[PDB]
């Protein structure tokens, strides 16, 4: 036989800031009495028996591997997730992009505060700059592009930046 749960995060970003919020839904096959889902933190049962685990205020304690499983369903492959502390974080889905892919860099801000003259950088070099905050796309990445990114901007008078990150341009 072949069931097998599944986990989906929404919003799509698997990396986030505290007080940031996310929900992990568990797509599975329920069965009589067992209209219940179990949530695993790393490899451990945790309360919330919902069908969608919901994190209002996030926090690092919250970081980890979330897998789920229902009755008639197998055990969800892992979906890793992480909460980082800061005024902003660099979002992206994967970090290992094939020569020519849909790069989506998001300079996100703590408690979604507002961001001024924002910048996406790398290796230390100011790549792209926006006045009011904006996501940063690149149709198809390029190998020349590989490097270590981060962004920075303005929270009122305050100035801020993200923890660096490694984008890896592969040859396929």
């Amino acid at each position: 036989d072949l069931p097998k749960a599944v986990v989906f995060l929404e919003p799509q970003w698997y990396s986030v800031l505290e007080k940031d919020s996310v929900t992990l839904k568990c797509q599975g096959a329920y069965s009589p009495e067992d209209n219940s889902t179990q949530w695993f933190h790393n490899e451990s049962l945790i309360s919330s028996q919902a069908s969608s685990y919901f994190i209002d205020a996030a926090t690092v304690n919250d970081s980890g591997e979330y897998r789920c499983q229902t009755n008639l369903s197998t055990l969800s492959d892992p979906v890793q997730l992480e909460v980082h502390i800061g005024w902003l974080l660099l979002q992206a889905p994967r970090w290992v992009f094939k020569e020519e892919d849909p790069i989506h860099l998001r300079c996100h801000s703590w408690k979604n505060t507002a961001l001024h003259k924002v910048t996406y950088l790398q290796n230390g070099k100011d790549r792209k700059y926006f006045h009011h905050n904006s996501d940063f796309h690149i149709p198809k990445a390029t190998l020349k592009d590989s490097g270590s990114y981060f962004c920075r901007g303005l929270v009122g008078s305050k100035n801020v930046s993200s923890e660096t990150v490694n984008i890896t341009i592969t040859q396929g």
Partner: protein, 216 residues
Amino acid sequence: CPAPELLGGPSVFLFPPKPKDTLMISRTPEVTCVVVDVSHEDPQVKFNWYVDGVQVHNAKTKPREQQYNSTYRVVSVLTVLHQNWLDGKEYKCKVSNKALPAPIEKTISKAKGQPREPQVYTLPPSREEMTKNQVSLTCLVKGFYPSDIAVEWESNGQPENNYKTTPPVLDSDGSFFLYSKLTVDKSRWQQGNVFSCSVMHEALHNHYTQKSLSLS
């Protein structure tokens, strides 16, 4: 707007003790942590002090709320050991506030370099000045280090109101130096009353020296 205020963590400034207070055991040196831009939505602000890296929430502290433009202002007084701030221990002020995605850490200490000896000379008004109805009794402090220091003027036993002082200036001679211009009505000068310049620094035998100016 019926009063703005806003968008960023409350910011934090931390000042050092006053020079004087640092050399007169009889005086209470006090390092000071200030927090402005404190929200009306999260006035609770938490201070943690650290002597050369110590005492997370132990004690020896002191604070209390304050209104303003439309935002709060908060203080933390940390009375410190004289010799401490002399030997150069560093003072850390960790400030926490629901408005800040994380803490803020500011550290204040005393300049790197071995202290210098405060040359002190007094200067009598330039004759060219003698004309006016009040003369400029000057006294200058040359070649000292660091900038911390204070100066005053006593006529006999009582000190004077009028007079000002410049802030330390970096002398090419590696050290510092400043001036202090005492203002007295013309007469007082001529009559004869002597006048003393008072210098407080950690290089003088008793962190204290005196030099005086008179005439004829």
